[PDB]
Amino acid sequence: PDPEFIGFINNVTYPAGREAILACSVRNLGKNKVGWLRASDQTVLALQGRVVTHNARISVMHQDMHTWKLKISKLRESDRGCYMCQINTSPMKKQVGCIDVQVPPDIINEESSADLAVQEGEDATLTCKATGNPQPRVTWRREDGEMILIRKLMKVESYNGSSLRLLRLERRQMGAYLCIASNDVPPAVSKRVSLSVHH
Amino acid sequence: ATSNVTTQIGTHAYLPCRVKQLGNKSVSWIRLRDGHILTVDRAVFIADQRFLAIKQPDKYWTLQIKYVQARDAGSYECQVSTEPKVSARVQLQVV
Numbered sequence A: 001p002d003p004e005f006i007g008f009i010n011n012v013t014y015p016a017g018r019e020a021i022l023a024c025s026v027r028n029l030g031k032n033k034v035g036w037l038r039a040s041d042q043t044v045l046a047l048q049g050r051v052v053t054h055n056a057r058i059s060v061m062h063q064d065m066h067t068w069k070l071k072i073s074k075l076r077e078s079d080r081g082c083y084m085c086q087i088n089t090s091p092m093k094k095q096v097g098c099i100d101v102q103v104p105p106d107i108i109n110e111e112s113s114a115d116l117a118v119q120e121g122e123d124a125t126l127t128c129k130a131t132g133n134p135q136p137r138v139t140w141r142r143e144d145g146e147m148i149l150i151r152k153l154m155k156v157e158s159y160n161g162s163s164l165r166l167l168r169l170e171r172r173q174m175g176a177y178l179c180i181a182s183n184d185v186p187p188a189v190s191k192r193v194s195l196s197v198h199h
Numbered sequence B: 001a002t003s004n005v006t007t008q009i010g011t012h013a014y015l016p017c018r019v020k021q022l023g024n025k026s027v028s029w030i031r032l033r034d035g036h037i038l039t040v041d042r043a044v045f046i047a048d049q050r051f052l053a054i055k056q057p058d059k060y061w062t063l064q065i066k067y068v069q070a071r072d073a074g075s076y077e078c079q080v081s082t083e084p085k086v087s088a089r090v091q092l093q094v095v
């Protein structure tokens, strides 16, 4: 009779480079048909057992008459999002499966501080811009282990933020600063930025 | 072409696909309000048989909606199955 879904599409979380499979199960499909739509950019992916998109990483598979599979190989971060399995009943029936594509942190040297020099008592902002999914946290600490000095100024052994803002610099504050970028997706990364303070 | 098509209730609407078909890629129509897949090439997915995809020799496609009703008004999108897609919208106005 009227086709219906068996369970719900299971949602997946993979690092980039892995393969994602979304299974859409239907009972009594009859003469109806199953289509796939990528929801983020409303792109038709497949219709029945045929792939529509010329994206060569995406395919569809059908063995058990009830289960319709969407496969995305070598997951890219832009594949993240939800995927609609449509049954052409009237009114339409649909389920959605979602892909979380995790990306490990990466610090961009172009948009991040290189070794810099400042005159004593001047200001100096160190900055590490980071990419990743989830968006990576950025932590600033001194390689030698001394506490950084920022407004309460006060002594902290770590600062969370992309831009470490140092002002009224004194001679003690010269040396190597680490910015660590992490998002619980391994591996965390760090950039080593060296600050020199002239008299 | 045009992104605004006006059609009297009860007459056939012809929605231009304002994007050119490239090579052997497919041409598909979707309804934007619900994401409902309508046509893929000449295959009609939606059960409503007033919907028809017309393939022209010069690679410019058309979505025909026979006997337009008020409920048909809204935005439609033509898309060519490159990755990323090439797409163009059409507002159908019913009068």
Ligand SMILES: *[C@@H]1O[C@H](CO[C@@H]2O[C@@H](C)[C@@H](O)[C@@H](O)[C@@H]2O)[C@@H](O[C@@H]2O[C@H](CO)[C@@H](O[C@@H]3O[C@H](CO)[C@@H](O)[C@H](O)[C@@H]3O)[C@H](O)[C@H]2NC(C)=O)[C@H](O)[C@H]1NC(C)=O
Binding pocket: A008, A009, A010, A011, A082, A095, A096, A097, A098
């Ligand atoms: C995979 O994820 C989908 C989607 O989940 C939701 O949307 C995402 C964008 C995220 O924001 C998620 O955090 C968010 O929860 C799950 O689908 C949802 O499943 C529930 C079932 O618990 C659906 O609710 C029901 O709908 C049925 C009919 O379909 C009714 O009979 C029930 O009474 C109940 O209302 C809900 O509609 C559905 N949402 C969508 C958009 O599809 C899905 O369950 C999940 N997969 C698994 C295996 O958990």
